[PDB]
Amino acid sequence: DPEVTLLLQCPGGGLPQEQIQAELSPAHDRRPLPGGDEAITAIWETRLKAQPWLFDAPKFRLHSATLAPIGSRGPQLLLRLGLTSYRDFLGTNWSSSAAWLRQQGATDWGDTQAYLADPLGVGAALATADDFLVFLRRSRQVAEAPGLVDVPGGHPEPQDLAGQLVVHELFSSVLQEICDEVNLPLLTLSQPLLLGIARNETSAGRASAEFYVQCSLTSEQVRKHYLSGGPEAHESTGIFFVETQNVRRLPETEMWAELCPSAKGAIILYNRVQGSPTGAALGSPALLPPL
């Protein structure tokens, strides 16, 4: 799958909030464009003159993420974050010239991402009490990945002594996106575990943090909550469920060709970090079938 690359695989079946540090610094921001950021302002002005109800919003930027030595005590991950915006995303990652900006960043900074907004997304492998994962169908009328299959998530808007509040907002945001789109009560959700970070090579290498969240409701009860909101309650056009048993071989199915890159990253990291058992019991052939 050339449209998705793994930047980080978390250890221990996934990291809880209390094991992650963030450094939010202007050293982690996008670099100004070689010929000036006026090119971003021009694209934004053209867009507002066609769609004047659009609004800008701040976003977190991923610079890098460093994992501790495996099996160590103390904090296990450092997230290096900067700030960006929807406007800067439309002028860089979304631009027809995004590949030229990546080549220029290699030349000038030894960093293909130096001139890219690279807003940080969040997504979830959301599991039911009866052992299914939750999938969403996108509208065929949206600009990005029209008509494809997705998982719950989004791109959090901002607001270790500013660090811990940022980690808290990332974990909070994946639960809020599940409650807003799937219409689940907050008290049916587990604290999330970070599985890893995936890059969308179809959007000039922007990254998403991918989480595991467990729901106490069955697949039928999740379906009821989603539908009982009515069409105005969700951006997606449908919900459906795949047994965790069958998620193992999803990349060999016709569904895989319909999955957006973001959602492919969530399922690869689920299979690697929560699936793939390590011990004698779950690794026995009757529980882990060959092939």
Please identify, using beta-carbon distances, which residue of 22 and 122 lies nearer to ligand RYP: 122
Name the residue number minimizing CB distance to ligand RYP.
Answer: 123
- At its nearest, how many Å lie between ligand RYP and the CB of residue 270? 11
Consult the annotation and say whether 169 binds a ligand: no
Say if residue 115 carries a ligand binding annotation: no
Nearer to ligand RYP among residue 104 and residue 261 (C-beta): 261
Closest CB 122 distance from ligand RYP, rounded Å: 6
- Exactly one of 40, 116, 134, 151 binds ligand RYP (CB under 6 A); that residue is 151
Among 85, 173, 208, 219, binds ligand RYP (CB under 6 A): 208
From residue 12, alpha-carbon distances to 118, 124, 132, 276 in Å are 28, 18, 22, 12
When binding is defined by CB under 6 A, the residue of 121, 156, 192, 205 that contacts ligand RYP is: 121
The nearer residue to ligand RYP, 65 or 104, going by C-beta atoms, is 65
Does 273 bind ligand RYP (CB under 6 A)? Our answer is: no
Give the C-alpha separation, 126 to 204, whole Å.
27
The half-sphere exposure of 45 on its side-chain side, counting CA atoms within 13 A, is: 6
226 is in an annotated binding site: no
Min separation Cβ 123 and ligand RYP, Å? 2
Among 21, 150, 199, 267, binds ligand RYP (CB under 6 A): 150
Candidates 123, 192, 196, 205: give the one binding ligand RYP (CB under 6 A). Answer: 123
Enter the tokens of residue 95: 């631009």
Nearer to ligand RYP, 40 or 263 (CB): 263
- Exactly one of 82, 153, 196, 205 binds ligand RYP (CB under 6 A); which one? 153
Q: Does 154 interact with ligand RYP (rule: CB under 6 A)?
A: yes
Residue 198 CB, nearest distance to ligand RYP (Å)?
Answer: 7
Shortest Cβ distance from residue 94 to ligand RYP (Å)?
Answer: 14
178 near ligand RYP (CB under 6 A): no
Note whether 21 binds ligand RYP by CB under 6 A.
no
∠ CA 285-288-291, nearest 5°, is 90
Selected from 93, 95, 173, 262, the binder of ligand RYP by CB under 6 A is: 262
CA 216 to chain CA mean position, Å = 23
Residues engaged in binding ligand RYP (CB under 6 A)? 121-123, 150-151, 153-154, 208, 262-263, 266
